[PDB]
């Protein structure tokens, strides 16, 4: 089914039509808290807000608002937190969320500067000896080490809660070559990165939900989570071919608006899942073939 559908849609040049139908059929729920006048400076884009029903709340009497949503894929048995790229005044709120939700990993799919414009604050330290202290939420964040590859970087960060005196290791999975409104260089380089996240244990149910972000926390981020989710379903279902990508994406859109921003991201998502299915079907060797193909040197 899935692979035949990709064919017919490509044959038809109907990607745009298919993607527009998704847009038209997506959920609409209220975002009243996001829209409160006091939260204007907590929102990067006017047109990207969390639904009230799925918003992550900060453990704060002051103002519990962050632009972040919990995507809870019931059949897949995986949750993700999708958030915007934090603003200069929200970096503290970001790491407070990571802390309160017990996340292990943060997946960043954007750069801080894209096409000449600041898309995301510099929310993590670039140098070991220049740790960050978030005064408002009483957190400290230290770069321990990093592993730079050709198209992504993995960082080991230590997050300390200054109130409770506890520390946690956070893994930062940063895809540094995925353009805004664009797609990865290939399914293999995408999968190699996704499988690296998976193998780190950051997506395990013993931790809180991964935080996945881009600039808005919907386009690239949507692409990443939809692939992962579909590949999970492929592995759980009696029939691996029953996975309907369009349905899985409308399901995710119940939780955060606007996931997958272009038709070509939608198409890439299908490519990824189709290729990724070789692993799921049992051929655990193809991981090594993605690694080599991705040119991570």
């Amino acid at each position: 089914e899935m692979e035949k559908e990709f064919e017919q849609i490509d044959k038809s040049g109907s990607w745009a039509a298919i993607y527009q139908d998704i847009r038209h059929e997506a959920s609409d729920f209220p975002c009243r808290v996001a829209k409160l006048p006091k939260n204007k400076n907590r929102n990067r884009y006017r047109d990207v807000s969390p639904f009230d029903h799925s918003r992550i709340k900060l453990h704060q009497e002051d103002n519990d608002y962050i632009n972040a949503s919990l995507i809870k894929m019931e059949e897949a048995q995986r949750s993700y937190i999708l958030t915007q790229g934090p603003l200069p005044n929200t970096c503290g709120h970001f790491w407070e969320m990571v802390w309160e939700q017990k996340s292990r990993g943060v997946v960043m799919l954007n750069r801080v500067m894209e096409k000449g414009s600041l898309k995301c604050a510099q929310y993590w330290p670039q140098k070991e000896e220049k740790e960050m202290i978030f005064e408002d939420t009483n957190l400290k964040l230290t770069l321990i080490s990093e592993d730079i590859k050709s198209y992504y970087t993995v960082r080991q960060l230590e997050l300390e809660n200054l109130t409770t005196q506890e520390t946690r290791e956070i893994l930062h999975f940063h895809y540094t070559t995925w353009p805004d409104f664009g797609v990865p260089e290939s399914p293999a380089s995408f999968l190699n990165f996704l499988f690296k996240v998976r193998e780190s244990g950051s997506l395990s149910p013993e931790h809180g939900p991964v935080v996945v972000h881009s600039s808005a926390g919907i386009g690239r981020s949507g692409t990443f989570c939809l692939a992962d989710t579909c590949l999970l379903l492929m592995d759980k279902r009696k029939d691996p071919s029953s996975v309907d990508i369009k349905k899985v994406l409308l399901e995710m859109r119940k939780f955060r608006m606007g996931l997958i921003q272009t038709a070509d991201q939608l198409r890439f998502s299908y490519l990824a899942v189709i290729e990724g299915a070789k692993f799921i079907m049992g051929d655990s060797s193809v991981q090594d073939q993605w690694k080599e193909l991705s040119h991570e040197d």
Binding site: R44, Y45, R46, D47, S215, Q261
Partner: peptide, 6 residues
């Protein structure tokens, strides 16, 4: 404000 889609 800025708009992500556009």
């Amino acid at each position: 404000g800025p708009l992500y889609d556009e």
